[PDB]
Design a protein around this ligand. Structure first.
Ligand SMILES: [Cl-]
Ligand SMILES: [Cl-]
Length: 616
């Protein structure tokens, strides 16, 4: 099938580079002054201390933080262990710090980073008392689980074949100790299988979870020191999460059945429900002491539920402000949870028998978090969050995603704060295709149902318009598709459009970078039956010259390795063809944002600047 802009898939074509150069200039002249004036306000919010991961050891908590241009790993209220700045001088390059873990004893720490925004990374294992690098592994490994004098770990094969000769993408599990390294699990597994391992709370069992896309899950358990005796004990036609093994009994969180999440247990092959499916999703569950601590997702924010090991509900905990809440780590006694919301970068909580707050960073101001519902084409209620400042200039910045079983739950958007301060309202919409209401909610936005997602977003945008708001619609990656499709269908419901790192060409998405992995979500363009519903919304095929379009910003990054910039370039050329007020920003500086904040903060400042200028 001919494509007039196929040459744009070659990012080294001189025609492509000319366009990128031209449009970055035009965009900079367009928001450059405003962006330079707002940058300090954005930078202030972006760069403040933000926790990443945390770990429990016998010696105390170890946590990572971002602040400004550096990232550190430190003893909680204690010594810095790893400093991204120290690292950069040692290796003489920009470094992104990915994750870390430790041993139970708090004497060994493993952390992974990437030199100069390399697509490859590094793993170092260090001694926590002296700080000596015990080991340095290249490429980086994952899921390090210390035992005795060594550890299990997983490798994810991206470019290379597996040792047993299987093509990527693939995963394999290894054991490493003084005598050396050997593969312990995953031999013969075809491409697409992923694995992870965790210990039981008592340290006696390996719990190994195996996953193939959305439609297969397997659980294995056995003696932590003996992979020869690891046995499959559960099979499911969806990925499930193994929680723990306690007193001969394996606990699993599964979205089998209606798809909302329940906890089952297996003992000697018999399967019992522990906590049956409820009205709202059960997103995670952990066992601590003799209790089950469960994260319940009620209209896309978290309430905390505490149960006995037998599934009798003991207590319920809600939060003052709707938030996202996730388990970071656990030991036998306690779990650490990270909370986040629109005006709360983070809270660090400790759960032992009850919930206790041990750290908080919040943005000061009289901010309100409200919630409402819009009604979609087919009657579906579309929940959304509303964030407001003290002032109301009737200007709304509306964010959605809608896909891939991702719930949109409260989180901190640094560039929205100055917006709220200027009378703006931030809206986060809970569209179909997400996990907000279970696997059925997700399925209701996949393949032929993808139009439902756009209908839900339209319903929110149109509600805001009727209420008198000026409206800027914003989304990234599958969320870029969201705004792009909505723009070509109902440009009349937005006064501004922001399209981030989008998927656009729905007949060729599967031919660029990793896009084939999205086939179960969107459908398969080689099949005419799927093309039939794909072409009904594909933005690349559905630009309407008869329509009037609002100011539109498409933004991407020249060196993104997941969502090919050609989507953005092609949609930009299509809008150019009809003289639409469209802009294109292509980030050229390398790497992402984890420990290289200024490039990312500028990008976000550019978005804020575009909203402020185009809605006025
Ligand atoms: Cl973004
Ligand atoms: Cl980015």
């Amino acid at each position: 099938m001919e494509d007039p802009y196929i040459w744009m898939e070659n990012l080294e074509d001189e025609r492509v580079l000319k366009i990128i150069e031209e449009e970055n200039k035009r965009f900079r002249e367009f928001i450059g002054e405003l962006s330079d004036k707002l940058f300090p306000e954005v930078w202030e919010q972006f760069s403040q201390p933000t926790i990443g991961m945390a770990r429990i050891t016998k010696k105390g908590i170890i946590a990572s933080y971002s602040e400004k241009d550096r990232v550190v790993i430190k003893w909680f209220n204690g010594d810095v262990i790893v400093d991204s700045k120290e690292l950069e001088r040692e290796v003489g390059d920009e470094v992104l710090l990915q994750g870390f873990t430790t041993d139970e004893e708090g004497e060994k720490l493993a952390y992974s980073f990437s030199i100069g925004g390399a697509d490859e990374g590094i793993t170092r294992i260090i001694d926590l008392k002296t700080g000596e690098v015990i080991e340095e592994i290249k490429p980086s490994i994952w899921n390090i689980t210390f035992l005795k004098d060594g550890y299990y770990f997983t490798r994810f094969y991206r470019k290379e074949k597996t040792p047993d000769g299987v093509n990527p993408p693939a995963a394999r599990m290894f054991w490493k100790d003084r005598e050396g390294e050997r593969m312990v699990f995953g031999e013969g597994l075809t491409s697409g299988y992923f694995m992870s391992i965790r210990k039981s709370s008592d340290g006696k069992f390996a719990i190994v979870t195996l996953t193939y896309g959305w439609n297969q899950g397997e659980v294995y358990i056995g003696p932590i020191d003996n992979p020869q005796e690891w046995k499959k004990v559960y099979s499911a036609s969806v990925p499930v999460e193994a929680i723990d093994v306690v007193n001969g009994k394996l606990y699993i969180l599964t979205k089998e059945g209606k798809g909302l999440g329940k906890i089952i247990a297996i003992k000697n092959g018999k399967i019992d429900e522990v906590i049956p499916e409820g009205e709202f999703p059960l997103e995670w569950a952990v066992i601590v002491r003799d209790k089950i601590l469960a994260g319940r997702l009620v209209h896309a924010s978290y309430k905390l539920e505490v149960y006995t090991l037998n599934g009798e509900k003991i207590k319920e905990i809600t939060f003052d402000v709707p938030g996202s809440l996730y388990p970071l780590d656990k030991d036998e006694e306690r779990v650490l949870l990270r909370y986040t919301s629109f005006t709360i970068p983070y809270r660090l909580y400790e759960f032992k028998d009850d919930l206790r707050l041990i750290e908080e960073r919040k943005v000061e101001g009289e901010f309100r978090v409200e919630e409402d519902f819009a009604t979609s084409k087919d009657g579906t209620k579309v929940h959304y969050f509303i964030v407001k400042g003290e002032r109301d200039e009737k200007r709304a910045w509306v964010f959605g995603y809608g896909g891939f079983n991702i719930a949109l739950t409260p989180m901190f958007f640094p560039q929205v704060i100055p917006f709220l301060k200027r009378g703006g309202t931030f809206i986060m919409a809970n569209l179909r295709g997400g996990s907000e209401y279970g696997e059925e909610w997700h399925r209701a936005g996949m393949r032929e149902n993808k139009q439902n997602v756009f209908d839900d977003f339209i319903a929110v945008l149109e509600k805001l318009k009727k209420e008198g708001y000026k409206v800027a619609a914003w989304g990234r990656s599958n969320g870029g598709l969201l705004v792009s499709a909505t723009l070509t269908q109902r440009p009349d419901v937005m006064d501004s459009a922001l399209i981030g790192y989008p998927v656009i060409d729905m007949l060729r998405f599967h031919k660029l970078y990793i896009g084939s992995v999205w086939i179960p979500e969107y459908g398969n363009p080689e099949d005419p039956k799927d093309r039939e519903f794909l072409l009904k919304y594909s933005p690349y095929h559905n630009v309407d010259p008869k329509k009037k379009y609002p100011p539109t910003l498409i933004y991407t990054g020249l060196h993104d390795d997941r969502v090919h910039p050609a989507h953005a370039l092609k949609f930009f050329m299509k809008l150019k063809e009809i003289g639409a007020p469209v802009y294109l920003r292509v980030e050229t500086k390398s790497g992402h944002m984890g420990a290289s904040p200024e490039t990312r903060a500028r990008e976000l400042t550019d978005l804020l600047a575009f909203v402020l200028k185009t809605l006025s």
